[PDB]
Structure formats: C-alpha cells, structure tokens
Nucleic acid binder design. Sequence first.
RNA 1: GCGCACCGGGG
RNA 2: UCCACUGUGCG
RNA 3: UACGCACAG
RNA 4: CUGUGCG
Length: 2010
Amino acid sequence: MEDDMACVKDLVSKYLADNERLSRQKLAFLVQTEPRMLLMEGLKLLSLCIEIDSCNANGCEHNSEDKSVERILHDHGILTPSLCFVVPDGYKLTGNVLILLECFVRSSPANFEQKYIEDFKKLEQLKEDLKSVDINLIPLIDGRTSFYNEQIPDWVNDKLRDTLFSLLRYAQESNSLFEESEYSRLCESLSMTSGRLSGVESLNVLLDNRSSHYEEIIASCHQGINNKLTAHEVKLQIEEEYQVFRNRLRKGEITGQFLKVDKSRLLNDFNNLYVDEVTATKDNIEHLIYQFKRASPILRFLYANIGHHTIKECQMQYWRSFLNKVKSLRILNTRRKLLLIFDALILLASIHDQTRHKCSKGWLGSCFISVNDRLVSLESTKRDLEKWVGRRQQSERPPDKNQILISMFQKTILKATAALKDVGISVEHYKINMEVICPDSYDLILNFDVSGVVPTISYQRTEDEKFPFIMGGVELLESTDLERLSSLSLALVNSMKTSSTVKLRQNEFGPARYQVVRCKEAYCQEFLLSGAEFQLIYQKTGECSKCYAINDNRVGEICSFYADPKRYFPAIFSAEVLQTTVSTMISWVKDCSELEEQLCNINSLTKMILVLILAHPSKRSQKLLQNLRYFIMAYVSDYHHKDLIDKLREELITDVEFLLYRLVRALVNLILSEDVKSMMTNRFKFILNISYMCHFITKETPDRLTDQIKCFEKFLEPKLEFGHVSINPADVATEEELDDMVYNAKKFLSKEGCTSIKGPDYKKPGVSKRFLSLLTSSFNNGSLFKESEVKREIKDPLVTSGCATALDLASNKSVVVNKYTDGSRVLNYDFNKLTALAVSQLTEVFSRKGKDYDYKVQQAMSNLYFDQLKETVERIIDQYDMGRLSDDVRISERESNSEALSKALSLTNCTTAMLKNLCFYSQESPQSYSSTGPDTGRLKFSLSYKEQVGGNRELYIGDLRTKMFTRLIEDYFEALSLQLSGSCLNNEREFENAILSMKLNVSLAHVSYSMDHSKWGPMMCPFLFLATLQNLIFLSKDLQADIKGRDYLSTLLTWHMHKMVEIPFNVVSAMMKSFIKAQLGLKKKTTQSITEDFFYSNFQIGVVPSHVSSILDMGQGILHNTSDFYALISERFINYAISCICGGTIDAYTSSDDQISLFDQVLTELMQRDPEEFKTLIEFHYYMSDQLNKFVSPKSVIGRFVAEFKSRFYVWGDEVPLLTKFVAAALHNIKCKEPHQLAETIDTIIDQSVANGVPVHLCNLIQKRTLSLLQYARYPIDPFLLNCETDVRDWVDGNRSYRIMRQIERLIPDACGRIRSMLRKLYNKLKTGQLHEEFTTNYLSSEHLSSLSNLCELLGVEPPSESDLEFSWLNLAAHHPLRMVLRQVPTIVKTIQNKLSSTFTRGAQKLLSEAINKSAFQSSIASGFVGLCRTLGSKCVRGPNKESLYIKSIQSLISDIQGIEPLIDSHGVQYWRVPLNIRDGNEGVISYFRPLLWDYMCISLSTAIELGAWVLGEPKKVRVLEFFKHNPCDYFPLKPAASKLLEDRVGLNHIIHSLRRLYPSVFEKHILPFMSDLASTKMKWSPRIKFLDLCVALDVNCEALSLVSHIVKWKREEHYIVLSSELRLSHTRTHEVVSTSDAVDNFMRQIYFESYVRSFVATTRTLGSFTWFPHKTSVPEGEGLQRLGPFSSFVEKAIHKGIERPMFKHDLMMGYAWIDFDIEPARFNHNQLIASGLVGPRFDSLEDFFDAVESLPPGSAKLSQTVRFRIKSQDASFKESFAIHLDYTGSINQQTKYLVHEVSAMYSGAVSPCVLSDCWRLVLSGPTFKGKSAWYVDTEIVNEFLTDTNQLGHVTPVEIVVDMEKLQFTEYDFVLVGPCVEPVPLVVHRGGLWECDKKLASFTPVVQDQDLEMFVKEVGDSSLDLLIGALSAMILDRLKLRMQWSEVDIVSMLKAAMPSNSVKVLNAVLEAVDDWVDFKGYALCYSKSRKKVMVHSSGGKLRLKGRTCEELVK
RNA sequence: GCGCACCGGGG
RNA sequence: UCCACUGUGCG
RNA sequence: UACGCACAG
RNA sequence: CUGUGCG
C-alpha cells in the first residue's frame, strides 16, 4: 500500500494549485504516514481550499494565521473587552460593522443542521460583548455538501477522496466508525493557539494624566547610564576596575570578607562563643550528666526515685463516669444543687469502697475529685449539704434528714436513668451498684473525717532542698524518662479541655495568692507512673500559659512550674520512636575506630539534648541548633565568610539554654576532634541531623504582640538607616513627598566604590551607574547569549502571555477591604480616640490587678500634658462603652479572596471572568490614571507576621486591585524570563539538570560555591527594576512594540513604587500605651529603642503614624519573578566579567536568591597553584555582586567537599538523609477533623519521610503511634486506616490502595488468592473488551455476595467458600458522614461542568458561592487532637433516617447479638464474622457492616487500572543470600517502576467526547452551553477507547466509587533515598495460558537477548522464526501492538498482511508527525579571508576587523549558514533530520551592516527535494529574513584575527540586507551534497536497529533475574568470552542511556548460573566496563592499581573515581 | 521556673 | 478579632 | 475542577 | 446543648 501512498503524494503535489497560503497545510500533508492522519490532513486541506475560495468570493480576507476575534480587533486598533476564544475563518471590518465568516462542508442532512445551529450559537456568544463596545456583528455561515472548488479539478478530487478512504479501509481495521460524525469533527482539530493578549495593553483604555513627575523619574533613570557600549569598552572598564581593586586589596585599603578555613581556629571560636557567661571551656561529661538531672522541676521529676489494686476498678470511678455522662445532658435545673448532689453521690461511693476493701483512690489528703474534674474539700461539701437539708426541712413545714436526702437521690437517679436510657444505653453499661444508697447516708457522711497532706501550689521559685525524692535514680540508657514525659505531656494536653464551670472560691487573699496557695478547690488531671498515682493541679481553664503543680497522696507538692499546654504534643505516646531515632543516629558513627572509647558519652549527650528540647520548648533554643548547620557546613569547606561566628551566636536567657549550649559544645568536641580522621562523611551527616533537631519544638509563635513588634522593627529599621520614610501619605500626593521620592531615586543610583577616595561601602543599598551601564550594554550587544538561545526568534511577551482567570486568585486566604467615611477611604488613625482607648485599656488592666506614685496616678486616671489627656478623655467617653470605640479606631478590615471576587463579579456585565474585565471593564473602575496610581487610589498593603522555624519575617497583604495589578506584572515578567536558560523557579527540568551538574562537579573534586543573599526582599526595590527595564532592548529590530511594552510596564512599576504600607493596629496601640506610661514617669528609661523614639517624636506633635511609603522595600515575595529575572541577568553578567578577567568558566544556577556555582578545571588548578589570585578573584566577585545591589550572605561556602542547592546536600559521592526533620514533622499535632482524613494525611507524610532516607522500621512505629492516638479516643480501628507492616516496595512501587490491599491480604490469607485469580482473568478479558456486558450492572450495580459468586463462577474458577463470605468490617457513617462538633446529576458531569464553566461569569459566581459556604461550614469545626477526642463519643453517628447515636450505643446493639463474632490482630485492626443466617429481621444494626471480599476486589481492580497488572500476581517473600555487610548508613537512590507510557494517558477530551457519544442528551444540556473553540475542541484518538467508554458508563450509572479517576492518573517518577539492607529484603510479586502482553514481552526479550550473541537483518522470516510471536491471535486489537516499539508499525502492516519483504527505514515512523527547524549563526571562512587581502598583524577590536573587511573588493565577504529541520512523530522514538545550507556572497557596509549580492542553496539529508521548497517557504514565514529579527554571526573565526581574546561572547548581532526575490528557491536551485545512496534494510545489531553504520533507534525492555539466568546458561555453555562481551556490551549500552540495573542482582545471578567461575566472569565484565554501575541495592567498580572489584560503602577506606569503596571479596 | 519589645500571662 | 505571594507532592 | 496537609523559597 | 478515654 506504500505505492498507493506514493501515488497520492505525487498527484497532490502535481495537481494542487501552487498557492503560497496553501503551502503550510500542504507541508503538513506530505509528511504523514498513518492512513487516518493522512486522511485527516487531506480533508483539512480540502476544507482550507473550500473556505479560501468562499472568502475570496465573499470578499473577506482569509484568517491564515488563526487569530481570535479579540486579537483581530486589537490589530486594527479597536479596544474591546475579553471575549470567548473564537477563531473565525474570515473577517471584514467596515468602520463599525464586523462580518465574520465560517465555512464547513457536510454531506449528511442529519449531520448538517446541528453544525449550523452550533456555529450560530458560537457567534451569538460574541454578539452581545461586541455590541457592548458599539460594534455591530453580522454572522455569515457558509455550509456546503461537496468537496468541489476552483483550486483543484473535480475528477482528481474525487479520486483523492476515494483513494484516501480505500487506504484507510485496507491499511488497518481497528475502528471503522468513520461516518460523517467522527472524521468531520476530527478535521477541524487544528485550533493551535498563537498566543493571547495579556491585558497590560488594556491600560490604553484609560485617560493618560502623566506629568512632570513621571518624566523626571524617567530622566533620572537615564541620567548617566550608557547602554550602547561595545564589548571592547566594557572589557577595558572591567580590566581597569580589576587592576585598581587588586592594587588596593593587596595594599590593605580593602577588607577581605573571606577567610581560609582553619579547623582548630573554628573550634576555638565556637568554644568561646558565650565566653562572658560560661565559666569554663572544657566541661566534664560526668559533671554535665549530674547537673542535667537537677536543672528544672520537670527534669528533676523525670529522673527521681519514685516507688494489683490499681488495675482493679471500684465504684467511685463508675459513679464518676456515670455522673459525668448524665451532667453532659445539662438538666440545668440549678447548677449548685446538681453539683452538690453529684459530690454527695461520689462521696457515698468512696465511703462504700473504703468500708468494703479500704481503697485509697480518688483522694488527695483532705480533698476528693468531683464530677467535673474538680478537686474539692469535704468540709465545705458537708457544711453546704447540711445547710441545704436544714433549710429545705424548715421550709417544707416531721420527716428527718436521711429520708429527704434519700428521696432526692432517688428522684435524681430516676430522672437521669429516664433521660439516658432513651437514646442507646441504659444504666447497666456503667457497672454501678445501688447499694451505696444507705438508709443512713446523711449520718454516714456527716461524721466522716479523713486526715492527710494538704495539696498546695507554689507560684514562686524556691530552693531545691524541698524535693522529697532522690534526684538521680533513673539512668539515661533506659526509656523510663521518655515514658514519664509522655504521661506528663498527655496530662498537660488534657488539661486544656476542662470546661469553665462556675468560678471557684478564693483560696487566699492579697499577696499570699501568689506565694503559696493551699488548694481547697481546684482542677486536677490524673496519671499513673510505675504503679503510683499523681495529680496535675491547676486553677485556670483555657489554652493560655499557666502554673501547674504535681501532687501525690503520700506527699503533696512534688514540684510546681509554669507551662504553655499547647507546646507539649510531640512527646505523647512516642517513646519507642525517639529511642529508635537515637539508636540509628548512634549506629551511624558506630564503626569509627577513634570513637570506640566514647560511644557511651555520645549516646548520653544525644539523649540529653533530645530530652532537653522536648521538655523545654523555647523559641530561642530553636535557633542555636539551626545555626549549627551552617557551622558544620563551613567546617569542611575551604573559604568562608568572616561574619559566620557573629551570626552563630544567639541571645539566651534561662539556665536551660546555657546547659543546652554546653551539651552541644561537648558533643561537637567529642565528634569533631583533631585526632579523628577516619569517617568524615558519617560525622558530617551526624552533626547535620543533630542540627536538624530544631524542628521538634513548634512552628506557632509563643507571643503574638511581641512577634508583631519584632516584625515591624525589622521592617522599619533599614528604611530609617537609609533616610527615606514618608509618614501618612495621601491619595493625592503632596509636593514635598514627590520631591523626596525624586531625591531618593537620585540617591539610590549614586553608589561609588574602588575608585573614589573612601572606597566601597559594603552592605549599603543602592546600585552603581558604571556597573548598571556595563550590564545593560553587555545584554544589548549580545555578549551574554549562548549559542542555544539564538536558534529561534524572541517572541513578544505582550502578545504571547495569556491573561489570568478570575478563579486563579480565589482561595480562603485573607485580603484587605477599605473603609469609606463619606466619599473617600480612611487612611489615618485618630489621635484623640486612640489615646482615649489607650487610657481606658490602662485603667481596665490596672483595675483587674491593682487590688506610691503609680497607685495614685492610676487611681486618678481611673476616674474617667495631664490636663490635655483629662479634657480629651472626658470629651470622648461622654460623647462617644468600649466595643464600638475599639471597632471605630480600625481603618481597614479583612475578608476572604472568594468573597471579594464574588462582590467584584457582581458588578461586571461581561460574559467571561478575566482580570482585564475586572480591572478596566467594570462599573466601579478607574477612569484615568497618573504616575502615583489610578484615580481610584494608590496601591495599599498591610503588615503582618509569619510563623516559622527560626527568626521573624514580615508579610504584606494587599487588596483585590493591587493583587490583580501585581499578578499582571508577575505574569509579564515570568513570560519574559521563560526565554532564557539557567532559572529553576518555574522549570523543573532546569532543577534536575542543576542537581545532575552539581553531582558531577562534586564527583570530579572541582570547586563549588553555595550562595544565599542577605535580606533579598527588603533590599530590592521596584525602582531598580524600572531602571533596568528602561535600558534593556529585547526586540532589537522591532522597536515599535518594545516602546509601548516598556511604557506600560514602567507605569505599573511606578505604581508599585508609590505604594502605601499600613502599620498594624495592635502595634500602634501598644506604642501609645508605652508612650503614656513613659511620659508620666511610671516606666524606666535609658534603652529607648529607635522605633520607640520615632513613635514618641510623632506622638509629641500630635500625629499618629498610619501609613509609610518608601522607595527602598519590595514586598516579601510580592515581586518574585522580577527578582528572579534580575538575579539571572546579574549573575550572567558577573560570570561573564569573571571569565573576562581570568581564563576560567563558571556555570551558575539560581531560583530566587539561592545559587549554586560550579567552577571548571582552570579555576581549581589556579586555587591549587596560586591561592592569592584565587582569593582576590573571590574578592572581586563579592565586590561586583555588591555593586549590583546583591549582598552575599554569611551562609555561603566555597569548597570541594560538600555541595548544597535548596536543601539537597551531596558529600564526596554520598547521599545525605534528612531523618530528624521528617521524624519531627510526622509527630506534630496535624489539624484534622475526621479519622480517615488524619490517616491519609499521616500516610502522605510518612511517604514523604520515606522518600528522604527515613527507614521503614521507624515509619511503622510512627504509624503505630498514630493508631494509639486514635485508640485513646475510643474509636474502632477498621482495616482501612493504616498499614503497620510495610516494606520498601510498599512505598516505592505502591500507592495507598496497594498498602490497603497488602493489609487486607495479611488479615485473611488463603482466601484472597481465589479473588486475585478471578480478578486477573477478568482484567485480561476486559482489556480486550470481551464481556463488557455482565460486569456493567448485573454484578457491579447489584447485590454484593451473590453477584461476587456469580462473577467468580462465570470465569470458570472455584467460588469462595461460605466461611469467606462471612468476613465483614464495621463501617460507621454507612448512611451519612459523621457529625463533627461545632465550637462556634452524576458527579462526573458536575466535575466536567465545573471545569468548563470556570471561565464564564455565572459559573464562576456559582462556584465562588458554594466554595464560600463550604469554607464557612468547615472553619467552625473543632480540630486537632483535643477536638477529635471531643467529637468522638459525642453523638456523631448518624442514624438510618435522621437521628444521632453514640458509638457506645452501636457497640451495645452489636453486643446484643450472639452470632456476630469480633476478631482482632496484634496491631489492633478489628473485623467481624457475621453469619448469613442472622442477616434478616435485625436490619437495624446489620446495615453498618460491609463484606471484606467485595471491597478488596474493588480496590484491587482500581489499583490494577491505575498502577498495572503486576499487582494481581502472587506475592512472595524471597530468601536472599547476604554476601556483603553494609554499613548502617549506606543509602541508595531508587526509581519507581513504571508501566504506563505516554500513549496510555487519558485526558479531558476523551471523557468529554465519550460523554457526547454515549449520553447525547446530558452532553447537550450540560456540556454544550459551555463549549468554546479552546483546546477542548481537539480530538485525539487512543487505543484505550472501549474500556474508557465502559468506565464512563459505569461512573454515570452508579456513583459508589470513581473509576475513570484512576485512569487519568499515573505513578510519579522521582528519586527515593532508601537503605540497601532494607531494599534487599523486600517482597516480590511475580507474573505467571497465553496472554498477548506476556507473549509480546517474551518476544521483545528474546530479540534483545539474541541481538548480542549475533547480528541479523530484520526480514519478515527472521522475526517470525522465534517461538514467542503473536501470529495473529484471536483478539490482537491494539493492546498487543503498542508494547512493540519500533516493530509496532511493521508487524501489523507487513507480518499480518501476507506480505514478505524486509523492513526499511520508512517502517519506523508511527503516529502523527510534524517538523521543526532551527537556524544556526553564520560563520566566516579563515582561508577565504586570508587569501583576499587580510594578511598582517591581528586587530585590536571587532570594529577594526570590520573596517579592515570593509576595505576590500565588493565581493570579498563570504558567509555560510545552516538551517536544520527535524521531523518528529507522535510516538517520539526516532527523528528524521536534514539540513539546508546557504552561501552568501556580498560586501560589509558601514560597521554592523551586511549587503548580500548572491545566494547559493544546497541541501543534505534523506528527504526528497519535492517538498524542500515548501519547507524553505516555512523559513520565509519567520521575521528573520524580513529585517524584523536579529541575525547572528559566530565569533570563533573572528578571535583568530584579534590580539586580545576573551573579549567577545559566542555570537555577534549583525543585520543582513537581502532582496526577497533572491531567496525564493523553487525546486531546482538546491544541489545535493550527500552520498545519495539507496535505502538499505535495517540490521538488528546490539541494542537496537542499525542502518548502514548508523544507529537510528533502540529498544530496551525490562530484564528480570530469571531471564538473565537462562540467557547466561544458554550462552556461557558454548563459550565464556562471548558471554563476557555480551554482558559488557549490555552494561555499557544501558549506562549510556542513563539507566540502572536496580531489578537484577548480578553477583547472585552469576553465582547460581556458574557456581565455579563467577569471580573471573565478574572481574572481566567490570574491567571491560570500568565504571560505577548501580545494581539492586549496591554499586560495583573495578580498580586498575589494585586488580580487584570494589564496592561503594560509606564505611569503606579506599577512594576510587570520587567514591568511597572497599574490597568486595576478602 | 511561661513570655522575656522593661510593658504580657498566671482563681 | 488573627497568617501574604509562589514551587513540588498526595488525598 | 476545588478544598485540606507536609516540605521548600 | 456536646470529652472522662494511658498501647
């Protein structure tokens, strides 16, 4: 059929009219190979001809470039709002009348009317929007029936159509549904986007009122900056600067800022950090251990000597629980009497227990525990009861007190039983006894007295002599201290949930209330330790910081302290986790020979540090451990910043912090001593993980007001230092502030250095005119560009970056809303109201505590300079009692983004929701604008703070309009920066390349530079960006779009320059109160911080600082992409300058301010030879960075040992695990609301932890801790929460569903095997589409057990036994989800509609409203551990119809049936056995149970759909022989195994079209009114179609669980850092009767194996001679033809066709194909120049060279250029490349001018010339040859004619002038230069397919151990050298492709295959390879000097190729 | 024994 | 009455 | 499509 | 109106 295709191509070429506008599509037709793609292209060409003739007839010009209506109107100068994306075929504009023409061809009357109405509706969409801007739209639809046109004869058209359809029929028979519904829709699938308007140009809509201020600023930007310098001038200036800098540095007038690393000096500096506060320098370990156990009350309690009925339960506990549950009902008759009755009942129960068995529980001396966690005394209880009984007896008037008391007790108990029995539980659940009600209860409790200790609380620090226990009993090696800490932390956390009952009585009076308090009434929690019973006693409720005491019945007041209860969570139920963490950290350095005598001390120090940070979670204790990271990073480097030691020191207060510092110093001295030089990497990572312990403390702030004040000080201080602070700016700017802005703009550009007398001034904000000019000139003249950045023209970002939808700014994050008084928004606080509020607050706070000068003044002030305050307060309070005053001082409010967006959309009449519509085309929109902002007001931000691990950080919050404008700027700058290489902020491939380059640099021991910058945000300014932009030229030959783009961006940047920032209200109030106190003499003096001075100076004159505007600060992350772009260009220039000075080269990667720099061999050699020159080069780099307003942080390090980039460390070829960070992350209080959400969040966190080197043995412990936390809340553990016996493969190759499958298989083995077999067979049948009927509704949408049995028996396998079907699990919320406690249409169709309707205004409004409602509902739910515990056991279960029940009610109902049998495992997973004979009649409770087998089958099927079929195999545990003893710190990078390729991925289009073709009514009524001509119109076809339709039908019919969601998802590919020992001990799922996939895999493996033993030609017989070959099986379809690679297009078209022929190259292009071309820079010829009159001395610069070339005969200029074309197919495996060469002969005109006289064209490739001209026409479509783009010439030849090299870059921009007619080559001017050889059949050599001495494509399947074993057995038996060669070739080929052998164990494979010759074979193979090769958990190499094989190990001793290694065999 | 901008919190 | 702009990953 | 959490700038 | 639970 290739002949038919050739005939079609020839007839199309020689019969189609040669029209230029038809060429491009014609080019798309002559390159396709698939018959369906060829038919689509032919039909598209016919439609193009039809529409072009139609538009020519109607007069409308053709839309050849496919621009939208808005783009077309913009090109004509019409300003229109954002419109729906519609691309008309033709357009015509007449003044104000727009005519749009769309042409289509339909030969089916049924398929004709709907297209017409669809086009009419599409035009009516734009009609109203066009009318809104006063433009009349006249739709014009041209429908036809026949493909007849004047562009081609009718007969040839008919023949072409018939031949195309016949070829489609004859080529492949897969889907013959090409009726006039599919192919006609497929024809218009060429709606590729050419870019959309950004919306920045819409600023032209408003009036322009820019004035002298704007032009003055612009002139200041252009004052003394020259951006037209050549390379020679900038080179000279750089040389001068370097010479002067080096001279002044050597002479000593400039400081170094860098020091060479001296380990002894660093250790000495670290030891003397706090030299003025610690007495000694070399502490004793034993003395430190002695001091540790006696430092604080908590530490003393943890290590003190303390110590059957405890397990036993008495009546007191039962009565307390029952009374608590009853009181929960809140009878609320009278709280006092109810509490008295409860206390009396509890006392009676306690008396009964003591009388019976003499129990001592529930009593603490003379007090006992009441119902509501109340510790109360018996004296008050008996007195109150006697008084109440006497009053009642004397008011009822004969009955005595006992009778009335018993009557009241019985009445209360009866009422409680009646109120409790109704819901789900009677009194029998609480095993109470009614015997406690005695006939003489009143007399029994009236004479009862108990003696004991008195509970107390100490509010002040006292001596340590009062501790009643020995303080050193517990050892540090045991885990007793951790368990005690866990119990204490749980008590502290539970202390927060005590409800605030009636206020307790006053225990003390006066000052004695804060010295020692005897507790008569208090609150207490109970915890048991080692058999004892302790009470935590407090007096205050809530989450605030408070004082606690620990009491015991034997002796009271063990210890009292202060604590914040919400900081002690991580220690709860985590005692084994921390012990295992410490054990692993110690075992990391266990094999160090010099540390063998210090292991015990190291373990003790580590455990002491961990316990200390857990027990005392201080903020300032968190920063020392963080700075330890930078210390250890600088320790192993070569050079470091000289301010590192100053940065390390942090202020400390308490003695615990100093003890922590001493412990850290001792540990560092022990580890990093001078006589230990054995294992540097292990000690380095040990110290790093010690440093990372700071994550264990918290992230939330300790105090809010202090944090806000610190952040404001950080924000304000640098501005005050600079000298520009404008106070209270107005919407209408004043003259003085504008003058100040201009003056500071001039000052910012006046930085000087290295030339002035004073010299450089480091760490000063500003930029230098000289270096700014040099940077701009270097960018403009093209010396910063690479050869790969000029292959294509630069697109204009103004018309190539799309706009942002309104829903891109929608979230729950806060946003500011302004307050308007009458017509203008308020911007200033009121002084009088503020001071009145401050006075009121002072009086209130003194009244609550003050119960001397201070007392007199406060009591005088409470009666409302001094007279002014009196008058103001009297006038305000009387005429304005605190709530409204407090709310009337604020000047702004907060809300959500969604609410603001909905309010804005409510005021827009447009159809689409875009940012440009909201900004400009709105009812409340600006009319004009100025330099300071639009007329609606200046841009506004407000200050806030952030919670993080470390120091403070301020944040800016803007309103909606400022956010929109900032988003516009960010999008523009992101589009601008996307066109240059080296930025990793928005490019993950760049990040991967950076990581690979860093690893390669470290492996070669080159110098590396890790850099961060100090205060990147608060130092950058928008003025710097504006100045840089005003001097840059992007389109050097299109200076018309650049002007307007720069103007718009400059206006926006000036708006950002004139922003106003709002000070927080709390800060202002605090400062006002401080000022009032200080002015009155109450406060002290002296310190008087600068911020306080500023506030006081403003207050004295009577001004409240409300807003501050300055030129210096740029928001924290507000302008991120602009900063990234500036950093990129600045670093490029700095590297260029460094390369100009020295001879070396630097490769740099930056993201925002983090940077990694890699030096080449030259710089490393220079460092090794000439240290002074290297150091001064570093100095010059620092100086140049400082000159460009970039300050290097003291955290930067230069060295050859360790590299790091964005927290990814690499040391000497090893991976650095981050264990402590993620261990601490997984142990924190995650804010969750339901158990399943918590379980999945913990699972995600544990997966992330496993990805970062945490062993699974500890992740299992973390999961067990989470399950224990769930069990504490008394929640049943279903088998769908967590898996606690996972392996490495469970996390690397499996998702959550796979883990659930593993757990279910573990629970019930020997029963899931039959289910797996049935599922395997069913999936195999379904993939071929076999049944597709029974599974739809007969089984899936039906009953469960019977349908499961029927499905199992249908396939021919044995059904599960009756015992298996009884297994079930208790599914709570089986009807409605759980009801949390508040403290204050098919689903697929809905999802599609939500995705598609997000662009339109109405759909956006609906989505915003529903999201607002959902967020409001969610935000009022109690979260955290306390909230989750309170929610559970609080009537959370929803009943059948509508009711709420306790979990205890359900459990009791289940317990009332004797057939249900519970079953539990070791880990606590509980399931049930429910026989089928009791499933009828008791339907009330059986509805909560679900069978396990059905859920297992569903989950397994979904996992097989998502991951692959391998999950259906039989799992097994392998017994692997261990041959090498790995070090406990030997890690390995691993890649998850993938099985889904790019052609198996399903997108939105497939689902939409399936819905259209399956449910036309639903598609028409839900999807149709939301369809535009967007990318959704594209129709792509995949082999997975029938199965996708089945899944869509299943999802539509039933909404139980999603099934199509698992198809649009794939397994992520990413590195995992795992342990070798754990990796080698994982389970395996093998695959096992003929399957198409198995057959094709076997065939591919056979071909791959036989490709190395011998070579053969890929004929039709050789491929058919193999045993495994799909000889036209029953159901091949496309499932078996896609896993074939290059042969996929051959066997279907040649093997299964009765055709005998060899395979050629043309049978290697599968899928849709398209071409892409690149233009290389032109090159000179050395010989031609030298033989034309250019002989003599070399020239000084490029200008001299061009002048010399100019003075030549007019034909002496000869250049050569090459254009490279590449054809790529949809199945990207082989690209067809060719090229065309152009020789230009002409003369060089004045300077940068090139006049072309003659052009010669040649070509080289394997492409027929019949299409070449067309390809050339494509090149003529670009603006390069039209003079609208830059033309570049290579500089390699030019450097041979220059005296001074290292002066130019790689390209030079030279404009070219040439007539267009000379460039129109037509099919005959091209002359071939290649060999012109006939096509040759391919040869199957090693690896892949080889052409004639050229490797085109390669195939490489996956090889297992069995296949390699059998291949070795087959090959090595014949000969050994052949086996060696084959193995070496395979290893080298796979290593060249960057692949790992992580699925094969070569050592054991060779041991098993060849028991006696494994060593020699391995040695020979590795010697042949001679490189590091990664295998299944280990890497091997061969050493030349020592003729052996080395294995990589961190515990090794030898060095080899940049890795530590040791001998494999001893 | 909290916070530890002197200023807050701790029946 | 309180917490911003981005990037990666998962549900 | 949203929402929620972890890590990083 | 909502917890009494130490694997």
